[PDB]
Each structure stands twice: as structure tokens, then as C-alpha cells.
From a paper:
Bacterial RNA polymerase ([name]) holoenzyme initiates transcription by recognizing the conserved –35 and –10 promoter elements that are optimally separated by a 17-bp spacer. The [name] family of transcriptional regulators activate suboptimal 19–20 bp spacer promoters in response to myriad cellular signals, ranging from heavy metals to drug-like compounds. Here we report one crystal structure of a multidrug-sensing [name] family regulator [name] and nine cryo-electron microscopy structures that capture the [name]-dependent transcription process from promoter opening to initial transcription to RNA elongation. These structures reveal that [name] is a dual ligand-binding factor that reshapes the suboptimal 19-bp spacer DNA to enable optimal promoter recognition, sustains promoter remodeling to stabilize initial transcribing complexes, and finally dissociates from the promoter to reverse DNA remodeling and facilitate the transition to elongation.
When including ribonucleoside triphosphates (rNTPs) in the complexes (see METHOD DETAILS), we obtained two structures of the [name]-promoter initial transcribing complexes ([name]) containing either a 3-nt de novo synthesized RNA transcript on the heteroduplex DNA scaffold (hereinafter designated [name]-[name]-3nt) or a 4-nt RNA transcript on a fully complementary DNA scaffold (hereinafter designated [name]-[name]-4nt). The RNA transcripts lie at the post-translocation position in both structures and RNA synthesis starts at position –1 and –2 in [name]-[name]-3nt and [name]-[name]-4nt, respectively. Compared with [name]-RPo, both [name]-[name]-3nt and [name]-[name]-4nt unwind the T:A base pair at position +3 and pull it into the polymerase through DNA scrunching, leading to a 1-nt transcription bubble expansion. Despite the same 14-nt transcription bubble size in both [name]-[name] structures, only the longer RNA transcript in [name]-[name]-4nt reaches and slightly lifts up the σ3.2 loop, indicating accumulation of significant stress on σ as the RNA transcript extends beyond this length. Charge repulsion between the acidic tip of σ3.2 loop and 5′ triphosphate of the 3-nt or 4-nt RNA is mitigated by a Mg2+ ion, coordinated by the triphosphate oxygens and imine N7 atom of GTP. Unlike site I, which is occupied by TPSb+ in all of the three [name]-[name]-promoter complexes, site II in [name]-[name]-3nt is vacant when CHAPSO was omitted during sample preparation, indicating that site II might have different selectivity for ligands compared with site I and that its occupancy is not essential for [name]-mediated transcription activation.
Author numbering:
A (entry chain D): 755 to 932, 948 to 1005
B (entry chain C): 3 to 1341
C (entry chain F): 410 to 562
D (entry chain D): 253 to 503
Write the structure that this text describes.
Amino acid sequence: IETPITANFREGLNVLQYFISTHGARKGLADTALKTANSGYLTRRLVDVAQDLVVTEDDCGTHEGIMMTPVIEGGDVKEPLRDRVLGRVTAEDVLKPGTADILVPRNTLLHEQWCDLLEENSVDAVKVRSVVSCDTDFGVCAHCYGRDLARGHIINKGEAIGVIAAQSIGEPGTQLTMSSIQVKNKGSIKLSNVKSVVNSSGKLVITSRNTELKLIDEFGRTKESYKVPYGAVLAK
Amino acid sequence: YSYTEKKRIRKDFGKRPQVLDVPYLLSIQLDSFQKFIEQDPEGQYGLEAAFRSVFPIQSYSGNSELQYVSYRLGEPVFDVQECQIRGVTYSAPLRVKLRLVIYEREAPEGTVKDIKEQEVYMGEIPLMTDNGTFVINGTERVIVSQLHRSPGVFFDSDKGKTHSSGKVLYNARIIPYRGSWLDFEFDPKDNLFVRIDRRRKLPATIILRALNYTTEQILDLFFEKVIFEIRDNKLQMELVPERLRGETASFDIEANGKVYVEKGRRITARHIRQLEKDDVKLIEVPVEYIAGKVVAKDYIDESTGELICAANMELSLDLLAKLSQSGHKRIETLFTNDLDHGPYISETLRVDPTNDRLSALVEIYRMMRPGEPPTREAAESLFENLFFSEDRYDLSAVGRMKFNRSLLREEIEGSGILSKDDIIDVMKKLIDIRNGKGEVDDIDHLGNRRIRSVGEMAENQFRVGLVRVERAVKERLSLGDLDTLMPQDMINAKPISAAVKEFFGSSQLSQFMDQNNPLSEITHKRRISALGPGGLTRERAGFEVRDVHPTHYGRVCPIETPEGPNIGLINSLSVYAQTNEYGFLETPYRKVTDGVVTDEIHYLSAIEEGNYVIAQANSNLDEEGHFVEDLVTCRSKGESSLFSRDQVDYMDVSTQQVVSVGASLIPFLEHDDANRALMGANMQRQAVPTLRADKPLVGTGMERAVAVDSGVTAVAKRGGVVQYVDASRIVIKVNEDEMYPGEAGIDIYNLTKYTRSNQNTCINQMPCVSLGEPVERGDVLADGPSTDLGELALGQNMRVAFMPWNGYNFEDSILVSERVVQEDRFTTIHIQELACVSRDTKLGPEEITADIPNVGEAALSKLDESGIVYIGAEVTGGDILVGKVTPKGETQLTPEEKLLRAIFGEKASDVKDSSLRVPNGVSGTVIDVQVFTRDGVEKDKRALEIEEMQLKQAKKDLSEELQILEAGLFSRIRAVLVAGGVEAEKLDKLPRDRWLELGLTDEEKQNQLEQLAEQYDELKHEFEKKLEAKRRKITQGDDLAPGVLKIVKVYLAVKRRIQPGDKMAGRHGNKGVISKINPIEDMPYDENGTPVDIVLNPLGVPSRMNIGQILETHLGMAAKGIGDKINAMLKQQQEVAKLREFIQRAYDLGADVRQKVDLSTFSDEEVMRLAENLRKGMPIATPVFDGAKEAEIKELLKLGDLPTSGQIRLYDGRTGEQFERPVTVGYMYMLKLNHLVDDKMHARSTGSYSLVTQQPLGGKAQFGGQRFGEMEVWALEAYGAAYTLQEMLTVKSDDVNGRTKMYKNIVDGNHQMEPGMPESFNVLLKEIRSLGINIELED
Amino acid sequence: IGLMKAVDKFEYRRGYKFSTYATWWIRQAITRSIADQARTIRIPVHMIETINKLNRISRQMLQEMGREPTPEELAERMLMPEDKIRKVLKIAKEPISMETPIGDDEDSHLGDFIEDTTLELPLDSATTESLRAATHDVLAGLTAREAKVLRMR
Amino acid sequence: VPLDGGRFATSDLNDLYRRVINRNNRLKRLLDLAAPDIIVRNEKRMLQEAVDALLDNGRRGRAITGSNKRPLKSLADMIKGKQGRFRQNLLGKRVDYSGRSVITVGPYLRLHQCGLPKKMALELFKPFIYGKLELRGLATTIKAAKKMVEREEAVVWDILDEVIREHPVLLNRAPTLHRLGIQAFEPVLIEGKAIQLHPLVCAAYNADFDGDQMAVHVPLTLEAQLEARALMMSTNNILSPANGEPIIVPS
Ligand code: 118
Ligand SMILES: [Mg+2]
Ligand SMILES: [Mg+2]
Ligand SMILES: [Zn+2]
């Protein structure tokens, strides 16, 4: 509506301001009741797909894993690396950014002291273990799962992780709603997935469509990352 | 001021004057039944227009007929209260007058053969009491109105959502009251289609062939024609220029003058401007231009008869040459303009498989009834039955008005069947909407939804009863001899009575009344529903029908509505809303004439209000109507804006015409969030009436009307002087002006005492007036439940402080003082009923006796010799109320028990104990007993005693009025025989009955001295009739069910004091549970020693924005502070002048308020009565959007010598210290809600199991278990608690051997189980094997 | 099945049409099958005719009096002993379905509140077992041969 | 089954079996009268339709309805759906030894403690009390123990206090969205009728004191008691299982 409500509750509204304020009140009250059903139905389908998965073994013995890095898109660092490896088990013997900086028997529950050790150095990628790559059939092993998030130690063999996964995803579902690159701080500029050429006006151009432009910190941890459109002329 | 209003006057803070009074709040139910049962000489209403739509019923062959002449309704057997005591429906008999006319066809029509007239009985009609309810099987019920879609035609579209291209698709629907549905629609390729009852789809023009149209006439009424001439073998064309709008020439346009527009140039407006200003007649064009257009007429060769081109064929120069080689000088073609005049119906004609009427009828028949080939008559009859026969189709008197107004016709009334013009006009307007003329309508506008009420939904069911009677009257008029036949032998009355009583007793809109409050009933009788027969379903209603619409303003309340899945579907009527003669809602407004608001009221509907500019109620006026300023806020076309003071047509009548009655009782509603005003209005309807009633200190001025219009009080019918007052009846002696010239003029009101309501609460009246004082018409004489001197009083006003206390008010909790539970402020009385039914068995009848076997004789002390408890007893759980024994079949005995009987010698007997007992936890006093026994059964001592005493004081209540009639009559004859002398004191010493044999006057006086003895026996003419009728109605039997011999009913009464767990609330959405009752000396107190009643949390106000509960707390202090002054001047014994001056200063305070109270016209006793009524605080009035302001609150706080900030210093009771900061302390109004914790608490160790699955039953009334549902098993297997789960499934619920073995292990001190397989698994295996599937357990 | 018998019993010599003779057997078959089927609990034919006659009498007494007659006013005109008129009036009711919706909703049915009546309470089971043990203990005091006779008796 | 009043009540499978039986008998008659085939075909069609409506009612045409104009329930509607055997009687049940009541706040409790009314606890714990009474010799037989308990003598309230000593109790509030919706406490007997809850556990329950109600369950065997003490007791549940954060924060 064009004219706003220029009053407050300590002063009192009009008949008309009150009338036009009732619309949003009923809209919200009606969305709540008709959203709870969708949330419950989703939880039931998740529980039914996940119900028979149980920690069966102690160690399957793979070397596979997944590469954990922070998420830096959309602006500043939204999720640090510490919040994404706390509790997981290392897949390979990672080394601080020199060479042969071993911290690992290569099966290492990354409790808080190891995360502090990783953050006093600066490392931004760790290969860890996962359940989607476990080699045990009819179950998972305790090392591919990691920490029991309510007890604070390695998971016990015999635990019903599927019902917990489904309940944890489903419980919060009632709160869901249902022209030029600038640079903030100073650091190196790095390019990847690139193929270059010099311009007629003394600038850089690239003939790559899928390149990436990263900003490097004092120590070499990527703080921002963009991608440029194809055909654009790189100013520097 | 009125008599009952001058006792306690409530001070008004409102500013705007009132032009229109609040109407009678029950008109919607009382005006709707009176149209159904009344005599209408013109039809269209109710029983008359239901008898004028079936009759006359004529013979199947054409021989005879039945004719309705008139009807009448009789008098009911019992009145309302007898119907409620006995438990029967309150109804009246319907007696219709018919005649039977036999006539022959041998003679031409001769119909004077014979005539037989008679009066037949057709059934019972339930009657509406004077408060708007129906008594049915002894219970009061309410019929709720329904909001549904009007009949008529509705144009709609799907907005680019069905087709992937993003194209909108239009459609049109016709919807009758009764009949079948017809709708047209478009498709992606721009072809019209039609379908009937949402069946398979057919091309549209099929239904134009079945109405006897040919392609010529089909193209005639839809299209426009342009003519081509052959004159010189040169195609010329008569043109009007505007037809060439928005085109581009592929040729040269030559003329007399300018050669206008040629290759590449398209035609702009100035080009056709040239062509029109020079009046360009026939233009030569290339013959390649016409090649591709379609032809209108059908052209044949004259010589050979061979046709060259048919209608609706596209042309080519081949066929044009062929045509000109035959001598045809003219050609008609269909004018097409591809932006506004598209080809729709003409390209539609080319996908039809039909060629003429018979093929079209056959195809419609194949659609409606697939699977057989039709004949030339079946198809024609089927199509003539669908829309064109008045007995299978009926657009209601309102459907026709809507149809005519939606097609811009000028006639309102018409016929209920469809026509050819109607279908053609619907097709025409759908096409016009496709070409960008006019627009779709929306279905949630309150111009497209109407209301039907009791007196229409009852008529629509009486009519189907009548139809089912006619369909059997028709047969008997055919099969037999009509010589010895009377109309009583032809009319079976059971279909009609069944159709009526099923509606009134088992419908979805016929509901058990809500009877907690006066306001609860007022609200239940004004509800509007969208569910029911012919309405929506809860699961299949969308988001858009639940919302608030701009047309709700003034007609439907936007606040009060449920909060579960019924949230938008049930609504409440506004205060001033009305209904049309067609059932459309309308609202009043004032008319503005030449910048002067006038006092003349106009009711307007939702369609009519969009054309005007309507100002607001918050608008000041220059003492003659003129607006004080020159930019007014107004509504127009569904929007709001600023307007000049001369563009204004109407104005609102009041600031409260937007809210319902339940939300116009909240003070400071303008300061509350809407989410919380919803909860406050909902919770006001659940308050329980307390022992004593107490007015609110802060109200809105709306309590008097809700109290009076609910019919819960006793209101005087005629003015007079109170002659007798008691706790149970009042007797008024009428004035002489209001006196009727024929009777005694004595009104008698009999009050209601300690009756139970539908919700087990207590209904009880008590008198207000005192003996000997005057009374005017309309005054309140006695109060009902939750009423104080004629005002609605739903709770008590407490002293509150807003602060935290040691974690006892943590989350919405409440902390209460002991002085509140020891003054009995929230104590309530509950009345409950129990019944003992004696029946027949296959072994003989049961008996109600006092000789109960195997019970101690202490437990039989409270029974009388007839076997029933005494009145006045004090019973607790387990006691016997009515003793009963049943004959018993002979029983087997275990060997061990046989040896026990052999040793100790005792033997059992033939009867078993089936007595009626008090349920556990209940403790009450017996206050009433009732006995119903069957005709042909021996009445007992107690039944006869009830008979005797009700006969006694049933006779005593009638001999009271004859003394007004008889004795005064003697004083009339005392002065007509004494004429001629004075014998007065000589006449006063002999007895009065001997006043007929005195000294006799002349014969005139003598003949009237026998006339007096004529009237003196007229008295006994009239008395014994009444008395014998009453005695016969008292001592007569009753109609108990087949098999039952007698019934006994007992009424208990219980008192309930407030306790931890009880729910409490205020009028602003603040609610919570009591957590603690704590001693009087632990409470915070002020510097004067006065402790506080209730302690509330301040953390509840900010994040809920119900600020109205703070302001009320500040105003209720200012009111109480004024009473404490008046009170002092009555202890201190001041004279009347001081009180007069102080009260006049208190009533004069504020801004320019509309109320004016001048006490200088009061007597001293009246001032003293007012002061004694005000010595507990002065009551205040604060309308909803017109209330009081902070300046006035603080001014009144200063008048009572109180702090202006509203905060004081308090001390701790436990340590005596001071609290650091000041605290808000004031008076609030609280309510006890019917959510008591005595009802809700339940526990079960073992009990009864169900029949098929053999799992515990459910509910508190069944002593049932608790459901361990599907998502609690998930939690238990996420913990890993396997043994807890295995015992929840097998031995607690469903395992039959384990659940009895577990009990005997627990008694022996061994906590172990042995689980088996549940029973529902075996049930599942059986029901799968019964489908032919072999399922088994493999080992 | 009645028409197939009317065809088997026809005689054309008597001169009447076929409709006049066949309608009797058709109506007989339909009427006999309505009274034998179409009731969950089956009533014999003589009781069917008694019920129908009482219905026909109460119809005309209701048309004539304006009320429903009490079994006394039906016994006086039907000329039967009043106890039989009371006995007949119970036999004309059809069983209710166990799926009958009871409340505002349609998820609560009549068949949910029906209790099993043939089960023994566990207090009674415990009492039976305790009494058996007590008797077995008291039967050990006296002689063995003198308790064998009580066990047999 | 007979109701109170002489009226009867029946299932719908009876209505559906009678039609099959007495359409099969008629066909066995017509195959003996040697009728024309136009009539035997109509019988075979009717028999097919009747068996189909007994197995699955609304699948192959219009649904056969009863004398109150509602479709009859069939052998397939008793197995499937939200109200079939599977979801209504096999995956969740009704149970004995359980109750419910309104909740209120007690701020003086420890974290492992709840307040339980005396009357609820007397009802839920009856066989334990009977056995304990007849072990102390205070009652001769179980049927006298019943009347002692029913009279509420003074020794009953002293037996109750040592029965509930070290007996945990499961509390539960609906809807149960995650596993912290069921927790085990130790009871403290109170007067009054409302249950008392510790102020720090109202966040895992999503509970508050504007009128909510809670359910009470009693574990009976030794293993269920061990699991209620070791796994579900409220002093083992301080962390969340979704993220590892604490759940008992002050509000
Ligand atoms: C033609 C017309 C009437 C009857 Sb029928 C009747 C016949 C067989 C089986 C059942 C009914 C009747 C009854 C008594 C005496 C004579 C004939 C009959 C009865 C009531 C209503 C309609 C027809 C039969 C043929
Ligand atoms: Mg509800
Ligand atoms: Mg709550
Ligand atoms: Zn693994």
C-alpha cells in the first residue's frame, strides 16, 4: 500500500490503519497451520528412507574421502574450516603448508586441540572420511561416521544413526519461510582455469569461459573468490 | 436518566455523538422463521409457496385432480419448560385443506361430476422460542446461517498457468439453484468448447444446431458482412473507413481525391480520417486481395442447380471466376479484424462432425449416456429435459436477477428455465472478453456470496418432502375407483415428518448451544459458516477464501475467528450489519449534501459502495455538518486516499461499525496487536459465572445491551409499582394508563433457581427491586448469571503488580494471595445429572428396591424405604444413590469354592446388584430427584409423594388471582344495593358471602343483584377449567422407550474453589496457569500496609505488544482511588453538600466529552443511593476507537491524590526490605475459564479392552489408556531403549497372556516379563488370507 | 423366475390374454423374495404380515386423531392382547453400522467405544490362584486317606 | 453385538457377504431350471460385481452404499490408509499404566526431579502397593488390600513413599519432534493436581505454562528401569544431537 502506518501502539491506530493491518496478521496465522502438515509429511518420508541404517563395524579400511574447505562465496567467509572438520576423521596424512609436517597416524579424531593446531598454522583444505564412501555393506563403520554429537566421543557400534539424521533434519522445518568487481582488503590476485592474451589498449584479456579469480591473504589462505564473464577485459 | 440507570451511572469518556442506535441483536434469526410460518397471500415465501409449487396433482391419465385451498397451524400440547422437563420436541401440528375433483372425458371436460372437501393432517413443525432457539428432544439448539455462492453466470480465466506458452484461457459457467451445470471454455488453438456436468468435452456450436440453427443463421448473429460487386469484372467494395484500423496495405487505395496509402505504408489514424472526411464510396481493389476470405451465404447455379460455394467456404479466384461465369453480381463476406474481430466461431464450425439437428442430438445423447444407440425420440426428450423443463431445472428468483444484471439487460424478473437468447448472450460476452472488452469477476467479493438462514433451509426441505408425497399420490389417482374415496385416504404423512425432523436433528448446521455466558449465546446465534451442505470442505479450501477482503468492511468482523484448521471458514457478523431481500449483506451510512453531513441513513450493498466516495468516522465537523478541514481521508474503488471536501458522498455512522460484539467489549483495543485481540475475543466466551457478580471498573459502554438482548434477565413488560417481592417470584401492579380495560392488571414473574445449563454450570436468578418502588417499561427486574444491576459482569477486578517474584511467574505463570481464595471470589457452582434405567430381560424384569443383597446396613441409611436417596444428603464417591437388583442366571462353581461353601455353609441368591453410585472423586449434595414410570406400571411411594406436593403447590399458585377478581367484585355490589341510603357500618359487621340478601333496592338494582350472582359464578366457570387441565397434565403417564419400565434421575451440586493448575486470563490476550497460593504475609506491600492480590511478569508485555493491559491498569487505579474518597465521606459522616460537590467535580472532568450529568436535579435520597453505590470505585466507559487519552487519565489520578506516573514503592514481606525501583500497581479485570484441572487429571493402572483388537480403550469417560503414537516409537529407538519399547508393545498394550502374567509377577515382587506375539498381527494375517493371498510365518 | 412358471402353466383355450395370468406369478415371486432376503436378522412371514397390518392401522389412526396412538388404542382396535402388541413393537429394528460417525469429525466411529465383556479381571485371577494354594495347604493337615475322599468328593 | 437398549450393531462385511451368498444360490437355481441364456448371463455379471465389491469396493465402478447412503467398507479398506491396521494398530498403540495432567513450574527442584501428585501416583502404582502391603503382613489377602487402598488409610501413604523411592518416570509432550521430547525423572510426591516441571527443561520440550499438558508413563521391569536411568535421565541430555551445542541455556 502507498500510505504507511505513521502511528505506534503507545499512541493508537485509526479504524483504517487497524483494518489494513489485519490482512498480514491473518495471512501469517493461516500460513503456519497449513505449513505444519508439509513439514510432518517430509519428516515421515525421511524416516522411512533412513530407518534401517545402523553403525555395524569398527573400521572398513578405505583411503577414500571428501575434500573439506571453507565456503567463501556470496561475500565474506560464511563458514570457517574449523566448524566443518571438528569431529571428523582424517582420510590422508595432511601436512602443514611446508612439506612433511605430519600431525597424524592418519586416523585422527580431530578434537579441539587439533583444530587449534590447524588454525595456528594456516591450512585450508583437509581430506576427511564420509559415509557416502564407506566400504561396509549393510551399515557404516565407526570411523567413517566420526563423533557422537551428543556424547563428545567416537560413535558406539550399534547406534541408530538414520532415525537421528531424519529427526535432526525434520525438526527445524517449521521455521523455514516456505557491474564491476571490487576488492575489500589487500592481498595477492590469483587466476585459475584461464587462457590469456594481451590487448591493444595495454590491458589483459582472457579467452576462458570458466575461470576463477581468487584473493590471497598474508599467508596464502583464499579469502574471496569470484568468476568473470567470458570476453571481459581484465583491467590488471 | 432511567430508573434502573439512575442507581449507578457510568462515566463516559467518548467524544463523538451518536446518530444511530444499536439494533436488536437477534433480528437475523427471528426475522427469518417468521417468513417461513406466516400467511402470505402472494406466495414466494415458505409454506404457502411450497404448497403452490406441487399442487394441483393431476391424474396419470387425466381423469381427476387434487386441489390445495388453505392451511393453518395448531396449538402445541406442552409449553417450552414442560418439553424440557419431559424431554420431547416443542412443535405445532400442520393441518391443510384439500379437495378432490373427479371429471370425465366422455363429455368434453365436465368437472362438476363431484367435489369432496376435507382437512388432512400433514405433520409437526418445530417452533422457535422467543430467544432464537429450538427445543429438540429436551435440548436447546441453534441453527447457524450459511454463506455460499450465488446462482447465476460467472466468467473466469486461468492466468497463463495451464499452458506452457503462458497463455490465459477463459471460461464461463452457469450455475442454477437446482439442475445441471453448463460451461463454455477456450483452448490453446482458440476454439470454443462446451461441457455439461463436467463431462467429456464437445465443440460449442453443436448445441447451436440442437436449437434448430443453420450455418447461415449461425454466422449471421455472430459476424458482420462486407459486400463485393462484379460490375465491370472489377471487384468493388462498399467501405466505411474505421474497419481498416490497424492494418497494412498490399495494394493501392485509390479514390476521387488523394491516393492515400500504398506499398510499405501502414494505415494510421489520419489516413482513415481522410477517408471519412471525404466520404469515400466504393473502391476498386485487386482481385488477388479477396482471394482467401470466407463467404457468408450459400450460392447455387440457377440453371443447373449445382452449388458453386457453400456457406463458410474460403474463396479463390478460381471460384470467383466460376461465380461470375454464372451471373452473380454480389458477394457477402465475413468482416474479420485479427486484433478485435478474430475468427473464433467460424473456425470452430470446421471441427464439428455434425451437419444438422439430428446428428447433434445423437452426439449429445452419445455423450450423456454411452453404450446404446438412440432413437429419434429418446434424444429429443433427453435434450428437452436438461435445461428447458420447469420440473428438472430452476434458476432461483435471485439467480435470474444475477443472470440479467451480469449481461446488462434491463429486466429483473423472468423465468427459471433457460432460453436461446440466454445461451447466445453468454457466448457473445465470453467472446467479447476474449477480444479485450470487459473483465473477469472474482469469487470472494461479497457481491458474489450470499447468506441463507433457518427459514429458507427449512422450506427447501419441506419441499422435497412434498415432492416425495406427490410421487405416490399420483398412483392412487390412477389405479382404482374414485367414487368412495376421500383425500385422507390418499395422503401418507410420514415422508414429510421424516424430512423435517432429520434436518432439525441431525444436520451439520444444527448445533448444541454454547451456554457458558450471555455473551456465549449471543455469539453463537450470530455466527456465519462456509461449511455444510452446498458449501466448502475443510480439506479442499484454499488460501484465498480464508483471507480478509476489502468488502468485509462493515459487514464481517476481521478479528474474531478460530485458530485451528477452521481459521478462515467461520466468521461473525458486525454490529450494524443487515441483510437484503436477496440475502446480500449491507451497511448503513449518512448522506453528505453540499458539504453538510445529514441525519439520514442509507443501507448499501458491496456492489453499490464502490461507486461513491465515503468519508471516515474520525472526522471533525463545524457544528452544522461542515468538515473542519479541506483534505479528508476517504475510501473509493477499493482503495484509500485524500480527497477534497466536495467530492464526498457518504460517511460512516459510528467508530465501532467495523467490529463484532465480542470485540467491542475490549477497552483500549486500538493499542493491541491483532494477533492478541483475536485471542482476547475468543477467550471472553469461556468465562464461568462466580458466586457473586462484580461489574468492571473500566468498560466500553456496551455491557447493558448485551445483557438485555440475551433474554437472560427478567424485563418488565408494563410500568407500575412493585407489589410483592420474594427470592423466587415478583408481582407487579400495573398503572392505569397501560391498563387493559378487561382484566385485573397484575403481572407475575417466576424466577429460575439453580438449573443446570448445557455445560453443567448453574443458572440462577435473583431480584433487584425492593418492595414498593416504581418501575417503568423495559426495566430490569431480576439478574441472570453473570449480570450486575443489568450489565454483563464476566469476572472480578483484582489488584495487580508487575514484577518478577522468585521464579513463580516464570513463563506466563500467575501467583495468587490466600486472601483471594478465602474470600470466595473465584468459587463456582457446578450441577451434574445421573440416571438409573430399569429394563426388561429374558429372565424377567429388574426392580428398583432397597433390599440390596451383600451390603452392610450402614450403606443403606441414606435411602428411603422406596430405594432412593433423600433430598439434602451429602454424598461422596462410592455411595449408593438408587438401589437396583437384576435376576441372575444360575452359575457354575469351582471345586475349591464348592468346598468353601460346604464348610462355611453359606449360599448365594438369585439376584445381582446393579445399583447407581457416585463416580469417584466427586463429592456433592443431592438437590433434586425425578421419577418417570410407564403407563400400566405401579406408581411407588416416592413418585406419589412428588405427585402430591407438586399438585399441592400447583393448586396454591392459582387461587391467588381470584381474590383480585372476586373480592373487589363484592365492593362493586356493596355500592349498588346501598343506593338510596347509607348502611355502611351496619353492613361491615355481618359476613361477606351474605351480601346478597340485604335490604333490597328498586327492581333495576334487583335484576343487577342477580347479575352479580351471574358473574359470581362466571368466576367458577373460568377457574375449574384451568385447575383440572393442570391436574390432568400433572398426573398423566409418559412415552418411555420400548422395554424400559421406569427411570430415576438425580441432580448433584458441587462447589469448586480455585487452586494451582486453574487457567486464568484477561481481556487482552494474556493467559496463564496459577502456580502457587502463598500466605498473606509473604506478599509485597506498600508503605501503608496493604498487600497485593496477584503478581504478573513484566517480560510478557514487550514482545507481544498488548499495551492495552498497561493503560487499563493505570485507569482502574484512578477509578478505585475515587471510590476511596466517597467511602471516607460516608464513614466520616459528612453532609450531603460535600458529596454533591465532589461527585459533580468527578463527573465533569475531561475534554469536550458528549456526556452531561447535572446533579442539581437530584433529591437527597437519590444522591445518597448513588453515593452508596459508588463507594467501591466509580465505573468508567471507554469506546473502542474513541476512548480516553493519557492526559485525562493523569488528570483523574491527580483528582484522587495518587501518583501521576502510576508507580509506587513496595516492600518485601519476607524480609521487610525495599525493592530498588518503583513498580506498576493497579486494578485489572480477570476471568476464570472453564479449563479446570479437576476435569483434566486422569490416570489408569488397568481397565477395559476393546472387542476386535483387544487394546485399551481411549478417553477419560471410558477410563482409557494413552496413545503411544508413531513418532514416540521413533524417539525411543533413537535413544536405543529396546526393552522399554518391547514392553510398551507387548505386555502393556496388546499381549493377552503376558498382560495377566505381568500383574501376578508384580504382586509377587518379581519385575520380569515373558512377551509373546501381539493380537493385531494375527488380525492382520487373517484379513490378508481373506483376500486370497497366502501369507505365513516360516520357521 | 416367476415368469418362467407363468409360461409353464398357461392355457390358451380359456380365452384370456397372457398378461392377465402372468402378473400373478410375477408379483408372487418378487413379494416372496423381499420377505425372505433383505433383512440382516430374518423374520418369518406371519410376523411380517402382523407388522404390516399394525403399520396400516396406526397410519389411519394417526390421520384420524392427529396424534400417534398408544398401544392401548392399538390393542382396542386390532383386538389382540396388549402384551402381544408390546411384543411385536420390538422386532422391527435393523442393526446399526459400526462405521457410523459419532462426532464433529469423521475419524471417530461408533465401533471404537465397544468393550469386550467376556474377559476376567486380574484381581480375580490372583484371587483364584491364592484360594487354590490356601485350600491345598489346609488339605494337608488331616489324614492322607481321609483327604483322598474329599478330593474325590 | 447388542447395545444397551436391545439395539444391535454390526460390521459391513456381513452386508457384503450376504449379497455374494444369495446371488450364488440364485445362479445354482437357474442352472437347474434350464433358463434362457440371456438370464444366466445377467446372473454371472451380477455375481462378478458382488465379489469385486467385497474385495475392493470403489475400484471397478460405482461404490455400493448402505441404507444411510454411505459406501460400505471392504476387506481392502481395513488394511490400507491412515486408519488401517498398519498405521493405527501396529506402529502405535494405546497402553496401560499411564496418565496425563496440566503442568506448572516448580523453581525449587533439582535437575533430575519432577513433582507428581499423590492421587495420580496412587492409581498408577497399584499392584506394587498390593504386593508391598501383603508382604509386611498388614493385609491377609489381595482383596483386603484393595479395600485398605480404597479407604486411604494412613499406612498406605507410607507404603507409597517407599515404593516410588528410586523408581524413575517418563514424561512426554506432543508433538514429539526429536528424542528430547521424552525424558526420565525421579518423582517427588506433592499435593494438588498439576505436575511440576523444572524451569530448565522447558526448551527441549518447547513447553510453557499457558495451558499445556503432559503425559506420564511408568516402566515396569528391571531392564526398562536400568535404561531409564542410564540413557534417558535428564542429566545425561545436556548437549544437542543435531549440533553439539548445549540445550539447557537459561532463558
Ligand atoms: C394384479 C393386481 C393386483 C394384484 Sb395383488 C398380489 C398378487 C400376488 C402377489 C402379491 C400381491 C391382490 C391382493 C389381495 C387380493 C387380490 C389381489 C396387490 C396387493 C396390494 C397392492 C397391489 C397389488 C395382483 C395382480
Ligand atoms: Mg475443533
Ligand atoms: Mg503452551
Ligand atoms: Zn567405513
